[PDB]
Write an enzyme that holds these catalytic residues in place. Structure first.
Site, PDB file in Angstrom:
ATOM      1  CD  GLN D 146      -3.099  -0.731   2.136  1.00  0.00           C
ATOM      2  OE1 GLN D 146      -3.662  -1.707   2.845  1.00  0.00           O
ATOM      3  NE2 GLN D 146      -3.607   0.385   2.385  1.00  0.00           N
ATOM      4  CE1 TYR D 332       8.133 -23.983  47.465  1.00  0.00           C
ATOM      5  CE2 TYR D 332       7.191 -21.846  46.997  1.00  0.00           C
ATOM      6  CZ  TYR D 332       7.210 -22.897  47.879  1.00  0.00           C
ATOM      7  OH  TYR D 332       6.320 -23.251  48.967  1.00  0.00           O
ATOM      8  N   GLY D 444      -0.069 -27.342  50.233  1.00  0.00           N
ATOM      9  CA  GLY D 444      -0.735 -28.107  49.161  1.00  0.00           C
ATOM     10  C   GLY D 444       0.326 -28.661  47.927  1.00  0.00           C
ATOM     11  CG  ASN D 480       0.091 -26.987  43.666  1.00  0.00           C
ATOM     12  OD1 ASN D 480      -0.705 -28.011  43.452  1.00  0.00           O
ATOM     13  ND2 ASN D 480      -0.517 -26.070  44.454  1.00  0.00           N
TER      14      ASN D 480
HETATM   15  C1  F43 Z   1      -3.857  -6.622   0.783  1.00  0.00           C
HETATM   16  C2  F43 Z   1      -4.688  -5.894   1.382  1.00  0.00           C
HETATM   17  C3  F43 Z   1      -6.040  -6.674   1.522  1.00  0.00           C
HETATM   18  C4  F43 Z   1      -5.820  -7.208   3.133  1.00  0.00           C
HETATM   19  O1  F43 Z   1      -6.450  -8.311   3.595  1.00  0.00           O
HETATM   20  N1  F43 Z   1      -5.411  -6.184   3.731  1.00  0.00           N
HETATM   21  C5  F43 Z   1      -4.678  -5.112   2.750  1.00  0.00           C
HETATM   22  C6  F43 Z   1      -3.176  -4.836   3.077  1.00  0.00           C
HETATM   23  C7  F43 Z   1      -3.142  -4.415   4.483  1.00  0.00           C
HETATM   24  C8  F43 Z   1      -1.570  -4.473   5.251  1.00  0.00           C
HETATM   25  C9  F43 Z   1      -0.848  -3.399   4.025  1.00  0.00           C
HETATM   26  C10 F43 Z   1       0.753  -3.201   4.593  1.00  0.00           C
HETATM   27  C11 F43 Z   1       1.688  -3.591   3.259  1.00  0.00           C
HETATM   28  O2  F43 Z   1       1.430  -2.548   2.341  1.00  0.00           O
HETATM   29  O3  F43 Z   1       2.488  -4.306   3.311  1.00  0.00           O
HETATM   30  C12 F43 Z   1      -1.859  -3.730   6.574  1.00  0.00           C
HETATM   31  C13 F43 Z   1      -0.984  -2.581   6.967  1.00  0.00           C
HETATM   32  C14 F43 Z   1      -2.107  -4.704   7.376  1.00  0.00           C
HETATM   33  C15 F43 Z   1      -0.941  -5.506   7.949  1.00  0.00           C
HETATM   34  N2  F43 Z   1      -0.558  -6.398   7.159  1.00  0.00           N
HETATM   35  O4  F43 Z   1       0.029  -4.947   8.786  1.00  0.00           O
HETATM   36  C16 F43 Z   1      -3.450  -2.923   6.028  1.00  0.00           C
HETATM   37  N3  F43 Z   1      -3.847  -3.482   5.002  1.00  0.00           N
HETATM   38 NI1  F43 Z   1      -5.339  -2.162   4.179  1.00  0.00          NI
HETATM   39  N4  F43 Z   1      -4.749  -0.582   5.208  1.00  0.00           N
HETATM   40  C17 F43 Z   1      -5.444   0.593   5.194  1.00  0.00           C
HETATM   41  C18 F43 Z   1      -6.397   0.996   4.365  1.00  0.00           C
HETATM   42  C19 F43 Z   1      -7.098   0.403   3.433  1.00  0.00           C
HETATM   43  C20 F43 Z   1      -7.766   0.727   2.060  1.00  0.00           C
HETATM   44  C21 F43 Z   1      -6.913   1.612   1.121  1.00  0.00           C
HETATM   45  C22 F43 Z   1      -7.601   2.662   0.047  1.00  0.00           C
HETATM   46  C23 F43 Z   1      -6.551   3.737  -0.294  1.00  0.00           C
HETATM   47  O5  F43 Z   1      -7.156   4.067  -1.307  1.00  0.00           O
HETATM   48  O6  F43 Z   1      -5.531   3.647  -0.165  1.00  0.00           O
HETATM   49  C24 F43 Z   1      -8.034  -0.526   1.351  1.00  0.00           C
HETATM   50  C25 F43 Z   1      -9.574  -0.859   1.721  1.00  0.00           C
HETATM   51  C26 F43 Z   1     -10.368   0.404   0.915  1.00  0.00           C
HETATM   52  O7  F43 Z   1     -10.252   0.310  -0.459  1.00  0.00           O
HETATM   53  O8  F43 Z   1     -11.254   0.698   1.469  1.00  0.00           O
HETATM   54  C27 F43 Z   1      -6.889  -1.352   1.757  1.00  0.00           C
HETATM   55  C28 F43 Z   1      -6.800  -2.569   1.209  1.00  0.00           C
HETATM   56  C29 F43 Z   1      -5.762  -3.626   1.562  1.00  0.00           C
HETATM   57  N5  F43 Z   1      -5.739  -3.867   2.751  1.00  0.00           N
HETATM   58  C30 F43 Z   1      -5.189  -4.498   0.520  1.00  0.00           C
HETATM   59  C31 F43 Z   1      -4.334  -3.876  -0.326  1.00  0.00           C
HETATM   60  C32 F43 Z   1      -4.780  -2.813  -1.257  1.00  0.00           C
HETATM   61  C33 F43 Z   1      -4.107  -2.384  -2.336  1.00  0.00           C
HETATM   62  O9  F43 Z   1      -3.465  -3.287  -3.028  1.00  0.00           O
HETATM   63  O10 F43 Z   1      -3.224  -1.331  -2.148  1.00  0.00           O
HETATM   64  N6  F43 Z   1      -6.501  -0.863   3.255  1.00  0.00           N
HETATM   65  C34 F43 Z   1      -7.214   2.295   4.786  1.00  0.00           C
HETATM   66  O11 F43 Z   1      -8.122   2.796   4.273  1.00  0.00           O
HETATM   67  C35 F43 Z   1      -6.569   3.181   5.767  1.00  0.00           C
HETATM   68  C36 F43 Z   1      -5.424   2.664   6.587  1.00  0.00           C
HETATM   69  C37 F43 Z   1      -4.814   1.485   6.232  1.00  0.00           C
HETATM   70  C38 F43 Z   1      -4.178   0.748   7.179  1.00  0.00           C
HETATM   71  C39 F43 Z   1      -2.837   0.924   7.681  1.00  0.00           C
HETATM   72  C40 F43 Z   1      -3.175   2.114   8.792  1.00  0.00           C
HETATM   73  O12 F43 Z   1      -4.078   2.072   9.331  1.00  0.00           O
HETATM   74  O13 F43 Z   1      -2.159   2.919   9.014  1.00  0.00           O
HETATM   75  C41 F43 Z   1      -3.787  -0.666   6.192  1.00  0.00           C
HETATM   76  C42 F43 Z   1      -4.028  -1.814   7.132  1.00  0.00           C
HETATM   77  O1  LIG Z   2      -8.678  -4.600   1.610  1.00  0.00           O
HETATM   78  S1  LIG Z   2      -9.573  -4.994   2.591  1.00  0.00           S
HETATM   79  O2  LIG Z   2     -10.764  -4.543   2.892  1.00  0.00           O
HETATM   80  O3  LIG Z   2      -9.677  -6.652   3.022  1.00  0.00           O
HETATM   81  C1  LIG Z   2      -8.402  -4.816   4.324  1.00  0.00           C
HETATM   82  C2  LIG Z   2      -8.418  -3.376   4.483  1.00  0.00           C
HETATM   83  S2  LIG Z   2      -7.060  -3.214   5.737  1.00  0.00           S
HETATM   84  O1  LIG Z   3       2.257 -22.102  53.513  1.00  0.00           O
HETATM   85  S1  LIG Z   3       1.659 -22.613  52.305  1.00  0.00           S
HETATM   86  O2  LIG Z   3       2.129 -24.169  52.343  1.00  0.00           O
HETATM   87  O3  LIG Z   3      -0.059 -22.181  52.429  1.00  0.00           O
HETATM   88  C1  LIG Z   3       2.261 -21.544  51.215  1.00  0.00           C
HETATM   89  C2  LIG Z   3       3.633 -22.111  50.964  1.00  0.00           C
HETATM   90  S2  LIG Z   3       4.306 -20.807  49.687  1.00  0.00           S
END
Ligand code: F43
Ligand SMILES: O=S(=O)(O)CCS
Ligand SMILES: O=S(=O)(O)CCS
Ligand SMILES: C[C@@H](OP(=O)(O)O)[C@H](NC(=O)CCCCCCS)C(=O)O
Ligand SMILES: [Cl-]
Ligand SMILES: [Mg+2]
Ligand SMILES: [Mg+2]
Ligand SMILES: [Mg+2]
Ligand SMILES: [Mg+2]
Ligand SMILES: [Mg+2]
Ligand SMILES: [Mg+2]
Ligand SMILES: [Mg+2]
Ligand SMILES: [Mg+2]
Ligand SMILES: [Mg+2]
Ligand SMILES: [Mg+2]
Ligand code: NA
Ligand code: NA
Ligand code: NA
Ligand code: NA
Ligand code: NA
Ligand code: NA
Ligand code: NA
Ligand code: NA
Ligand SMILES: [Zn+2]
EC number: 2.8.4.1
Lengths: 442, 247, 548, 548, 110
Positions: D146, D332, D444, D480
């Site tokens: 990201q 202990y 105990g 224990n």
């Molecule tokens: C791989 C995933 C799917 C998943 O399961 N988690 C990810 C990735 C994960 C990683 C990204 C770290 C890295 O880059 O190596 C972490 C930091 C979690 C972790 N492993 O530590 C995270 N997301 Ni995500 N993720 C976030 C977010 C989001 C937003 C990003 C949208 C934007 O346009 O950039 C979208 C979801 C959305 O579209 O609503 C997103 C998706 C995604 N999230 C897409 C990758 C998106 C892309 O390819 O770039 N996160 C956010 O919306 C804000 C906060 C942010 C998190 C980190 C923090 O809070 O500082 C991070 C939270």
């Molecule tokens: O891309 S995903 O919505 O699955 C994760 C956001 S951190």
């Molecule tokens: O005296 S008691 O056996 O209750 C506890 C020992 S640490």
């Protein structure tokens, strides 16, 4: 005679089986076949005699990659399965003519075990099944080979695993459809903690039977949880009838009308028309080129919508033969129908909510997995109160091999054993027949 | 079906994208090979990889649902499930994240659509994905400036535009050429270089973006001024609220 | 005159905040950042030292194609890069959670009844003082009875102690004031009267075990460690046999019958003991934050300091590490406590409600919810539309959704004086938002928000609960960022508008009104800023027992 | 000639160890001790600094009416006061627990099958290497996908990393060696052969998350954290969509299907999640200890290094803090790893067994239990009778019971080659001891030892289990001190006498054969001594982000 | 009446509800029994004690015959009394969640 509603009941080929059945004849509280399926699931255990034997011979007991060098015991357990199982049955049964059942399968490699109902009648919960079964087999194996006092604890480890050090039977060579009572997300949840793959395994990927078994278990849990008491009871019964039992052939007919070329959106249109045709909804107000629908019976609208939701899953995931989009269907069926109608989606947003989190936790790094590992106890999918998980079971029934964590991978022992039980494999038949049978007692 | 309430152009556009009887305007011509290159799942002329045997070679369970539900062709073949994912600028891209998922499950069979703020995705069987993807790229689903084809590093939906009016792209998969006023795709959706760039045509001009957009914005049509659409949303809130308490 | 976030937008970008176009890609990637440069160099040193590659800016995609922004900690004039607000790199944030985790509240009411009724001995202010001197020796890990005991180094456990409070002023005055949390000193008069009326003649211990132990062990250590040293000090100070039958009564009182944990234990899927973040109910989190006792004329400020406390703890530490990990969720949380953005939106909403209804004077019903939450949601979303820089700052939809809904839910609660209608406004805000922009948050963001409306007023077994009693283990809330800290805020909201001394537990409120805490709970955002600047000194370090 | 404990007793006391009388009361109380003097001084400073009384030598009874003894760390020439072996005062001990708590084992076998079968992509040694460079950036908390991610400071998380191992030498050869635990280098030939045969072509990650995170959070964070960064690194290295359906398979594999926790979760009364001390089975604890691969010609040393590992962890940190707290349980545990006392008793036992039967050549039965356990128990107890200094050294009956029974139990298992008869020996020792001296341990102490004989060979639901599979949550053992660590040693004893490469899990064995760990698991008692001398440098400190 | 719900020393100021539950115990117990029972005259028992201050409740055995375990007793009893109290006094949607907290506590957070 609490509710006036009646439903027509169909089989899984869309044939009317019984007309005009009182809604409460499908209630988990009244229907004897639901009672038998639930008491069945409480008492049934699969025994993997081959796994026990192999774990003993290699000393690989107590969980993944665990081994105790020098503890190996070479016992011809499968070769003596008949004597071992008969010796176990003697311990498990309460009396000679009770409903204890012990059946060898796979030439002795496996055993289906049903612990006697009498043990459950004086038990708080359901763990007597695994624990009575496990000790009967451990003791039967020891007696069969006269295993020494010094070595017998290895037999125990091969059968029940690392338990009592682990909370679970970790590395055990027995399985149940239920999981231990400690793992419940909440009290009353035990019938929800049955993996979708286990349901699909037990119904052998028959979609409508998988939907039926899942809905019966989900909505039966709603009664145990108290969710189907008082104001909400009719909603839950209508949900079981229309979504899980193909009541009025609504699910089946929606699938028929939309299976060739249909999409989620086409199913929606047919469902709304059908609810309009049936008087379930009516136009309440006209906006600009937009009809706002209302209903005098929210629980019936909900039921119709839940039927369309199941049909939409079968259409959508059926057309892909790939289960993963059930999370999408569960969301947009409900999102779309709300903007189509002005009425609340299935379970008043809760299926949509579950679907959001389930979509995420089946397409992201954070947890979850494929559709088949979820269940109504899973934190991701416990939120809808019975209206979501039965769709996931229908979807995995329809999957043709896109899943790495398929029922073949997670549930093989459950498939071999639990599918043998007719009421588990073909629950819709039994539940319909029982409702027919008790029809005039309501 | 009526799809979506509201009296704005935005609301009409949302209805049109969902309505499979509305012919999406085609804005650009893309070759079969170029769609495949852009997806980046297989090379042109490489056989479709399989995840299971053809359905004809398997013994399905007897099941009326399977009988009644015709499988898409890639399911019949056992294709992989693969994806295409788009990011839509909040500066008036024609399609937007919920509009896509809603429209996809109205228009397309066998679809797993996911909606996020910065990315919207569809997964389905590969040969079928390829056909859907031609439509997603050639029609007014896509603007080559305000929309981007991105399987990772999706950032930019909420970002300011560059001087060309293009949406930010950490990996610069879509390059505006000042000499032609056209956008070329120079990388596939995952960010690897294409041998030969794909023409995606000219960005839509400002007036046309306004006509076609499905986002509401104070400098466009504001959602608060679509009072009927705000309706049904407040209605749904109230009825859901009442429902979860009693019936 | 200017919106509260304008200065922060002006600090981050060259463009004025309304400008729709900018320049990318020519910023030097990570080289634009002082903090990323520090990281690159540290990565080189770490890999060289240990012989395994580690941080390397060229792995994966090249950060800093856009501006890597400074953030203003809201209410402060401190601007830091977002890495400085990561809980790993911020000692203030780690200590905030350590002060919560290592705290338990333990009655002396049953204990004193045991002394009197079972031992037949007297309890007075003077015996309580002697007991408290004794337990202040013993609690950090030192002996009072056996010969040849080996003990903790007092400087390593300097942050562990026991204090008491009671609502009886005359009794409070007779216990030595070194050990007493003085309610009349810490609280304004009306709040003090409320708190003292709640506590009455009850006498409560606030016990803090050593940070070094909390960090070696877990939250469920705290009430055990507490009870061991209470028990020892009861034996020593009241002249029991050292291990008689009555001793067990003190154990059961300190461990069970009059213990108040900060957090309850969690179910197996997210298995944790007591005093972990998931067990802390939103009402307690609001009460731990001490903004209420110092900023009581400003209900917004109190509500948003609670949001900052919970967004950091629940999103960064709890959901972003205990429940996931890695880079984690810093900016999911920083959105609710940086740039004065939530502040702008919530002051808008507080002003709106004040001018239209009078704080706490709106009908407690869905009409007020619809009114206030819609108004404020439109306000906040309009800001992102009018200011492109603001939209680029809060770039993730989930961040916007949580910020906008927090303002809407807090404002609705300011109006009605009831948290539950506030919570309904939170959900309505999400649904309006989703329709406005055709997007909301991440893939799984509105699990709880689509369930939300229906579960606000539900009375069913695992559905119905006043918001003050909900927390991170309420089923719909168990998984996802961008909600739990804001809900703590909405639980604080109506009580802050009402002038209430506490949101859900008066003992929790008093227990953190203690100048001997390491972290300063009256100024949570200030503390986060101090930790970002690397100016916060935590307890628990091992410098004294390692090489120089 | 001398018993092995004579040097230690001579250093402690002016008398020869045989003398029966000494002088008390005129030694100066706490003033005889450098360490107690340090503590008095620190307590006055701490109390003045914070305005609350703290450590005070005049509270309760006066320590040091008798000699406050030095202890020799067994196998070393290091002598320290017992306070220096308290886990709070010993960073080596804290880092041992951190190194375990922050470690998880995570296969790549399912992950590689998802790649090849669902994605249709290739996995090779080269793609694995690229993946491991990627996860070694990501695992400590840095971004790969990201834009605008904020990251952990690489120096704060320098101890986090990911290595692999595999039984296939050719494949191991093709992966950058920086990422590889080389089984052929770390183990003697015969043990290398066994371990490689157990692993086969499986490829397993050993993931260590940062100590700083582990201390902020808990053990159940470790497999989550691990799975997130694996998940990210699988996305980046294998060109997945960043969040497609197949991404969920990698999550489920990393968190569930191919994860090996160090500890399993605990039931509600002692509610903890994974990777807490109470979930670590004895057989894993033996395998964590690395004495087996360096001290393989000496089965006693191997077994007693394990005892030391377990006694400190299970009695001092686990039962003495997680399950109780305060001054806790240092001595202990130190009884089992100081003064060469257990060593003398167990070497005696080994020699008896060697002379009489031959190691592992005794019948695996009760006759052997009665012989060996009885003989060794009488030897041990006679040492306490012949050497009054020894008895006053190990002054607590519990301590002596553990030590004598550990020798008896290990020697029984040295004769039988079987841990379960070892265990029966341990219980018999307890009963003989109890009758000989008309005392055994604390009030105990023998709950488990009176259940013990009957539960050694039981097969019943919560009774029956090979000793290797038992651990701190085995019901009888759950409460224990003075047993868990010695059971770990009896689990090790038969395997050590047999020459077995591992006791219970060969993945666990290999996973700690890593020189990049902070704690040196090959020389646990050396490390405890280093930490006692304040010479051990732990991970996880926050000095980089605090003031000077 | 005090808004003291959710655990020891817990209270939510401004949420107090002044309901004569004990004074209306017989109506409330009769309405709760109608929800607990499966059929009229099954083995459900609801009996007031201590002048209406307490109730003895035995949930019908038919509910346990199709249950996995025993938590239907508290769960069915709790929801039936919550709904009966709500219905007795016509407690609004906005306030009914306090009746739920007074009956079953902090569950499902705890
Ligand atoms: C791989 C995933 C799917 C998943 O399961 N988690 C990810 C990735 C994960 C990683 C990204 C770290 C890295 O880059 O190596 C972490 C930091 C979690 C972790 N492993 O530590 C995270 N997301 Ni995500 N993720 C976030 C977010 C989001 C937003 C990003 C949208 C934007 O346009 O950039 C979208 C979801 C959305 O579209 O609503 C997103 C998706 C995604 N999230 C897409 C990758 C998106 C892309 O390819 O770039 N996160 C956010 O919306 C804000 C906060 C942010 C998190 C980190 C923090 O809070 O500082 C991070 C939270
Ligand atoms: O891309 S995903 O919505 O699955 C994760 C956001 S951190
Ligand atoms: O005296 S008691 O056996 O209750 C506890 C020992 S640490
Ligand atoms: C789904 C579940 O994980 P599993 O499905 O059990 O693998 C659950 N995760 C989480 O809720 C992760 C929480 C924070 C990560 C997503 C933040 S929006 C848990 O690990 O207990
Ligand atoms: Cl109804
Ligand atoms: Mg044979
Ligand atoms: Mg025999
Ligand atoms: Mg039609
Ligand atoms: Mg063409
Ligand atoms: Mg006085
Ligand atoms: Mg002399
Ligand atoms: Mg002598
Ligand atoms: Mg002398
Ligand atoms: Mg390969
Ligand atoms: Mg190299
Ligand atoms: Na500027
Ligand atoms: Na990078
Ligand atoms: Na879990
Ligand atoms: Na001497
Ligand atoms: Na003293
Ligand atoms: Na407990
Ligand atoms: Na410093
Ligand atoms: Na009755
Ligand atoms: Zn910790």
């Amino acid at each position: 005679a609490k509710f006036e509603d009646k439903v027509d009941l169909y089989d899984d080929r869309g044939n009317l089986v019984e007309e005009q059945v009182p809604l409460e004849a499908l209630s988990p509280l009244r229907n004897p076949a639901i009672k038998s399926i639930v008491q069945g699931i409480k008492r049934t255990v699969a025994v993997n005699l081959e796994g026990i034997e192999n774990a003993l011979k290699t000393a690989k007991v107590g969980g993944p990659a665990c081994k105790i060098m020098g503890r190996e015991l070479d016992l011809d357990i499968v070769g003596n399965a008949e004597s071992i199982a008969a010796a176990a049955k003697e311990m498990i049964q309460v009396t000679e003519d009770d409903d204890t059942n012990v059946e060898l399968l796979g030439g002795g490699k496996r055993a289906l075990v049903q612990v006697p109902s009498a043990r459950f009648d004086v038990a708080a919960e359901y763990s007597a099944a695994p624990l009575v079964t496990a000790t009967a087999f451990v003791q039967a194996i020891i007696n069969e080979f006269d295993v020494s006092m010094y070595d017998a604890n290895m037999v125990k480890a091969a059968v029940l695993g690392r338990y009592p050090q682990s909370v679970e039977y970790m590395g055990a060579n027995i399985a149940t459809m239920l999981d231990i009572p400690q793992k419940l997300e909440g009290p009353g949840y035990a019938l929800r903690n049955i993996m979708v793959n286990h349901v699909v395994a037990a119904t052998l990927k028959n979609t409508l039977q998988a939907a039926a078994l899942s809905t019966i278990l989900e909505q039966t849990a709603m009664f145990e949880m108290g969710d189907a008491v008082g104001a909400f009871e009719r909603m839950h019964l209508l949900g079981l009838a229309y979504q899980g039992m193909n009541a009025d052939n609504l699910v089946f007919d929606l699938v028929k009308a939309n299976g060739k070329e249909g999409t989620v959106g086409s199913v929606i249109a047919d469902l709304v028309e059908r609810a309009l045709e049936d008087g379930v909804i009516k136009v309440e107000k006209e906006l600009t080129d937009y009809k706002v629908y209302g209903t005098d019976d929210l629980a019936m609208w909900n039921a119709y919508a839940a039927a369309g939701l199941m049909a939409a899953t079968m259409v959508n995931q059926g057309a892909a033969r790939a289960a993963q989009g059930v999370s999408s269907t569960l969301l947009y069926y409900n999102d779309l129908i709300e903007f189509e109608t002005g009425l609340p989606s299935v379970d008043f947003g809760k299926v949509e909510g579950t679907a959001v989190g389930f979509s995420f936790f089946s397409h992201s790094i954070y947890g979850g997995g494929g559709p088949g590992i979820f269940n109504g106890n899973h934190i991701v999918t416990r939120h809808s109160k019975g209206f979501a998980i039965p769709c996931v079971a229908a979807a995995m029934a329809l999957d043709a091999g896109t899943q790495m964590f398929s029922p073949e991978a997670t549930s093989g022992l459950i498939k071999e054993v639990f599918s043998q039980v007719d009421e588990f494999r073909e629950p819709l038949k039994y539940v319909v027949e029982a409702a027919a049978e008790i029809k005039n007692e309501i | 079906a009526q799809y979506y309430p509201g009296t704005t152009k935005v609301a009409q556009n949302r209805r049109n994208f969902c309505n499979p009887e509305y012919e999406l305007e085609k804005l650009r011509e893309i070759s079969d090979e170029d769609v495949v290159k852009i997806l980046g799942h297989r090379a042109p002329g490489e056989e479709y990889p399989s995840v299971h045997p053809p359905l004809e070679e398997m013994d399905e369970p007897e099941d009326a649902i399977r009988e009644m539900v015709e499988p898409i062709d890639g399911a019949k073949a056992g294709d992989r499930v693969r994806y295409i994912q788009f990011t839509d600028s909040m500066y008036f891209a024609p399609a937007q994240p919920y509009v896509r998922s809603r429209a996809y499950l109205c228009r397309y069979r066998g679809a797993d659509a996911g909606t996020l703020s910065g990315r919207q995705i569809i997964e389905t069987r590969e040969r079928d994905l390829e056909k859907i993807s031609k439509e997603l790229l050639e029609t007014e689903f896509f603007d080559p400036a305000r929309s981007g084809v991105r399987g990772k590093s999706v950032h930019g939906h909420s970002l300011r535009l560059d001087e060309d009016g293009m949406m930010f792209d950490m990996l610069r998969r879509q390059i505006y050429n000042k000499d032609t006023g056209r956008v070329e795709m120079v990388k596939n959706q995952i960010g690897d270089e294409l041998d030969e760039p794909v023409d995606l045509g000219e960005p839509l001009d400002e007036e046309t973006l306004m006509e076609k957009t499905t986002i509401y914005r104070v400098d466009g049509e504001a959602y608060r001024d679509d009072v009927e659409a705000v309706e049904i949303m407040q209605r749904i809130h109230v009825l859901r609220s009442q429902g979860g308490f009693n019936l | 005159a200017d919106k509260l976030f304008i200065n922060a937008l002006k600090k981050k970008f060259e463009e004025s905040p309304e400008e729709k176009k900018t320049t990318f890609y020519t910023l030097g990637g990570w080289k634009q950042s002082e903090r990323k440069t520090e990281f690159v160099n540290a990565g080189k040193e770490v890999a060289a030292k240990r012989g395994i590659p580690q941080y390397n800016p060229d792995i994966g995609t090249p950060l800093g194609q856009r501006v890597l922004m400074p953030y203003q900690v809201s209410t402060t004039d401190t601007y830091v890069e977002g890495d400085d607000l990561h809980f790993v790199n911020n000692a203030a944030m780690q200590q905030m959670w350590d002060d919560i985790r290592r705290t338990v509240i333990v009655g002396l009411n049953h204990a004193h009844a045991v002394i009197e009724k079972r031992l037949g001995k007297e309890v007075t202010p003077e015996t309580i003082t002697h007991y408290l001197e004794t337990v202040n020796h013993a609690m950090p890990g030192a002996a009072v009875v056996q010969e040849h005991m080996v003990e903790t180094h007092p400087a390593l456990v300097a942050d562990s102690y026991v204090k008491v409070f009671t609502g009886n002023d005359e009794i409070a005055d007779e216990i030595d004031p070194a050990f007493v949390i003085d309610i009349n000193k810490q609280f304004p008069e009306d709040q003090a009267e409320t708190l003292k009326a709640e506590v009455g003649d009850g006498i409560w211990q606030v016990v803090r075990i050593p940070t070094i132990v909390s960090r070696t062990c877990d939250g469920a250590t705290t009430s055990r460690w507490s009870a061991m040293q209470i028990g020892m000090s009861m034996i020593s100070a009241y002249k029991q046999a050292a291990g008689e039958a009555a001793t067990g009564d003190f154990a059961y009182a300190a461990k069970h019958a009059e213990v108040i944990h900060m957090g309850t234990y969690l179910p197996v899927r997210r298995a944790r003991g007591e005093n972990e973040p998931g067990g802390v109910p939103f009402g307690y989190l609001a009460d731990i934050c001490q903004s209420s006792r110092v900023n009581y004329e400003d209900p917004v400020r109190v509500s948003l300091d609670v949001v900052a406390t919970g967004a950091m703890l629940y999103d960064q530490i709890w959901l972003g590490s205990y429940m996931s990990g890695g880079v984690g969720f810093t900016q999911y949380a920083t959105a609710a406590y940086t740039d004065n953005i939530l502040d702008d939106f919530t002051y808008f909403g507080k002003e709106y409600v004040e001018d239209k209804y009078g704080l706490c004077e709106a009908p407690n019903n869905m009409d007020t919810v619809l009114d206030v939450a819609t108004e404020v949601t439109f306000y906040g979303l309009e800001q992102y539309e009018e200011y492109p820089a603001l939209l680029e700052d809060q770039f993730g939809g989930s961040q916007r959704a949580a910020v906008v809904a927090a303002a809407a839910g807090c404002s609705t609660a300011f109006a009605t004086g009831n948290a539950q209608t506030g919570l309904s406004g939170w959900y309505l805000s999400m649904y309006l938002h989703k329709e406005q922009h055709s997007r909301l948050g991440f893939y799984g963001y509105d699990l709880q928000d689509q369930c939300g409306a229906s579960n606000v007023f539900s009375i069913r077994g695992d559905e119905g609960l006043p918001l003050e009693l909900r927390g991170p283990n309420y089923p719909n809330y168990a998984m996802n960022v961008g909600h739990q800290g804001e809900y703590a805020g909405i639980s604080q909201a109506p009580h802050a508008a009402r002038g209430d001394a506490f949101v859900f537990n008066p003992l929790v409120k008093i227990a953190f009104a203690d100048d001997n805490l390491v972290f300063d709970f009256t100024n949570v955002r200030g503390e986060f800023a101090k930790g970002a600047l690397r100016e916060f000194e935590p307890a628990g370090e091992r410098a004294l027992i390692t090489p120089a």
